[PDB]
Amino acid sequence: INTITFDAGNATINKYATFMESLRNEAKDPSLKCYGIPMLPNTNSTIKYLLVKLQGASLKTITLMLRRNNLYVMGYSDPYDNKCRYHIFNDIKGTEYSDVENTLCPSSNPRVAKPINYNGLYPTLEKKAGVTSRNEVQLGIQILSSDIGKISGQGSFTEKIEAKFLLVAIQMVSEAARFKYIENQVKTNFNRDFSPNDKVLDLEENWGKISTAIHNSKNGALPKPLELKNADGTKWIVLRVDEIKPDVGLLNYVNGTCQAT
């Protein structure tokens, strides 16, 4: 469908809230839903990818390409030297690789490869970025805008700022779309840089666990206790779908029927 665009250079809470709502309605399987939370399609949807264009205050752009089944950033393009430059992780290959290369930068127009010489897993990204953990990498709307400027159209940039930009972009686009809690952490701190708290990391880490739990619930009761973390890192025991439902924007795909509402 339509490329979804977010202008980070000229943002408001309301435009970012709109962007989330957009991304969530385009990503979701139109029919699937459990306890009223929309669920992503499986890997045989009629449309398998989503493109997301971001703009900085410099007016430079970066377009991310997400796999729609699990909202995974597979790679990105920028305008470079009158060419479309595509950057793809080193583990995307064959039919996926050439749907990504050709949808970010079509055949009929000039393009040039610039590999991401690592994979898109958080550990790998933390390592290139030089941090033990991603709570050391700050997030925010100015940071996202500044980061687009540091890479878009630049002949040379380090793998450290590229991995920092991808830690920020995966969390403010993909994690924020999966979790309404992370979207509300960006709006709360809209006008500042912030470090993700311990509930933000735990939710990221447990999205699959959470999706399967809700999908598998009977009359609103979770199959077993779910132990997550509060904003201060203390333990939180979830027993019922409506204790976690305020924080979840989308569900990972889980096979089978579930209570739809």
Ligand X SMILES: Nc1ncnc2c([C@@H]3O[C@H](COP(=O)(O)O)[C@@H](O)[C@H]3O)n[nH]c12
Query: Which chain residues interact with ligand NAG by CB under 6 A?
Result: 255-256
Shortest approach of ligand X to residue 120 CB, angstroms? 3
Contacts of 152 by beta carbon, 8 Å cutoff, 6+ apart: 56, 58, 60, 61, 62, 78, 79, 80
Q: Which does residue 256 touch among ligand X, ligand NAG, none (CB within 5 to 8 A, set by kind)?
A: ligand NAG
Return the structure tokens found at 103.
């949808």
Q: Which does residue 97 touch among ligand X, ligand NAG, none (CB within 5 to 8 A, set by kind)?
A: none
Q: Does 65 bind ligand X (CB under 6 A)?
A: no
Spatial CA neighbour of 144 closest among 170, 113, 165: 165
Quick one: 106 or 123, whose CB is closer to ligand X?
123
Q: Does 204 bind ligand X (CB under 6 A)?
A: yes
- Ordered strands of the 83-88 beta sheet: 4-7, 49-55, 61-67, 72-80, 83-88, 111-113
Q: Does 73 bind ligand X (CB under 6 A)?
A: yes
204 is catalytic: no
The backbone torsions φ and ψ at residue 234, rounded to the nearest 5 degrees and listed phi first, read: -70, 155
Residue choice 72, 118, 157, 190 for contact with ligand X (CB under 6 A): 72
- Ramachandran assignment for 82, one of left (phi > 0), alpha (psi -120 to 50 degrees), beta (any other): left
Return the structure tokens found at 50.
């989503």
Residue choice 9, 41, 120, 140 for contact with ligand X (CB under 6 A): 120
Quick one: 9 or 251, whose CB is closer to ligand X?
251
CB 199 within 8 A of CB 230: yes
Contact set with ligand X (CB under 6 A): 70-73, 120-122, 170, 174, 204-205, 207-208
Residues tagged active-site: 175
